[PDB]
């Protein structure tokens, strides 16, 4: 029954800074919550029990604050190996029950993504099925929006993204979108646009090409 | 001496169960709680229940009741889970983990702290059988070139289960590559792209194959990457 609730949801910071994050409890854990540190692939470690108590191992700049229902992270001269997913889980009653997290990736300067397009292969088209590629290349912030365009109609429900880690040497997310339709459907329109939103563009971005060029 | 060793990856059809393993050492098996906690793919943390192994006391969330059996087996040193009737919904990483009651001296399962955590064992739910990817050119064209360089890849569709490895020019190429993570498709098949940015001057004179390699299905697919009239 105890909803855990986190802010920000994800946070840029720099090495050296002093970042401080919150979770929530729907009611009152006293001091029954701990907090955790996950990184991509791996398991969940403990770093916060008893609301401020210090795991053994745990560097001290990580710091809990708070009893009833709002409680702390202070994480205070951030290193390299801190950028990473936090979690705070109720540990007062069962079901025990975790915030949502809130990631602490990399800030840099704001860079808008290069964006290219791609049609479907001959090859694919034969057999019947047609996916159309958006790359948003080397951007920052993460924050990004694509709409699909065909014949200037927008698209709903046929198309799927995925984004790559934040790149280890310029800090930058690039972000790939499939937008999928059979051959039939393909063939009857002319212009495939995608339409590109995000922070370091002045206004959003659209490429296109006409099918059969 | 702390160690949660978990079975290894699972991959069932929907109907069937999964029976994962959470090897301990000596003494957390002995004194505490070993609790299971889920995480579907991009997801948070669910509670599934927990088990006092000494005894075989086991308490389980609501929301699994019915379909989950926590069990513990001393001659061992092992916890299992057993969650039947899987659905897709059900994919995900399954932990086990140590409730430790610090400051706490009476009580196994208050406070519940997990201070330690097994590695997960991942079980992936689907009708799918194992095959092989579909590879198609993501083919450079005017519209895929910013300033003096230009994009291309390969479209890695349709194959089951993860992963699929990508490589380019037999591995000579890593500079400018990103291969992204592949989406579950509404067909129970995944699907993944893999970019590469090279200089617009050499489309000319050097050809770009990308490399994909599916373990599962024994199969590769080398792609040679063209340029396109758009």
């Given at each position: 029954a105890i909803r855990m609730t986190q802010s920000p949801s994800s946070v840029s910071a720099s090495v050296g800074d002093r970042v401080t994050i919150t979770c929530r409890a729907s009611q009152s854990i006293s001091s029954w919550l701990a907090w955790y540190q996950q990184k991509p692939g791996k398991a969940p470690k403990l770093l916060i029990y008893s609301a401020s108590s210090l795991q053994s191992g745990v560097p001290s700049r990580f710091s809990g604050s708070g009893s009833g229902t709002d409680f702390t992270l202070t994480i205070s001269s951030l290193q390299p190996e801190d950028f990473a997913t936090y979690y705070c889980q109720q540990a007062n009653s069962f079901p025990f029950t975790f915030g949502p997290g809130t990631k602490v990736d990399i800030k840099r300067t704001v860079a808008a993504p290069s964006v290219f397009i791609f049609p479907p292969s001959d090859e694919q088209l034969k057999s019947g099925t047609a996916s159309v590629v958006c790359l948003l290349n080397?951007?920052?912030?993460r924050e990004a929006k694509v709409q699909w365009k065909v014949d200037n109609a927008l698209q709903s429900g046929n198309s799927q993204e995925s984004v790559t880690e934040q790149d280890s040497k310029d800090s930058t997310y690039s972000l790939s979108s499939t937008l999928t339709l059979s051959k039939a459907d393909y063939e009857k329109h002319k212009v495939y646009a995608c339409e590109v939103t995000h922070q370091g563009l002045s206004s959003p971005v659209t490429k296109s090409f006409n099918r059969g060029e | 001496q702390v160690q949660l060793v978990q079975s290894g990856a699972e991959v069932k059809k929907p109907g069937s169960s999964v029976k994962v393993s959470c090897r301990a050492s000596g003494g957390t098996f002995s004194n505490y709680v070993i609790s299971w906690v889920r995480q579907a793919p991009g997801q948070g943390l669910e509670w599934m229940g927990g088990i006092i192994?000494?005894?075989g006391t086991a308490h389980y969330a609501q929301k699994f009741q019915g379909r989950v059996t926590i069990t513990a087996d001393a001659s061992t040193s092992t916890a299992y889970m057993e969650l039947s009737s899987l659905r897709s919904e059900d994919t995900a990483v399954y932990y086990c983990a140590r409730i430790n009651t610090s400051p706490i001296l009476t009580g196994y399962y208050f406070p519940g702290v997990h201070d330690y955590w097994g590695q997960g064992t991942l079980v992936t739910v689907s009708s799918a059988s194992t095959k092989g990817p579909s590879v198609f050119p993501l083919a450079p064209s005017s519209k895929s070139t910013s300033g003096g360089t230009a994009a291309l890849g390969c479209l890695v569709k349709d194959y089951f289960p993860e992963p699929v490895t990508v490589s380019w020019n037999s591995g000579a190429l890593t500079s400018g590559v990103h291969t992204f993570p592949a989406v579950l498709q509404s067909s129970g098949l995944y699907s993944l792209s893999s970019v590469v940015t090279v200089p617009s001057s050499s489309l000319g004179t050097q050809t770009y194959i990308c490399n994909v390699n599916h373990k599962p299905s024994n199969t590769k697919v080398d792609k040679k990457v063209e340029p396109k009239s758009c």
């Open positions: 080397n951007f920052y912030p | 192994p000494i005894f």
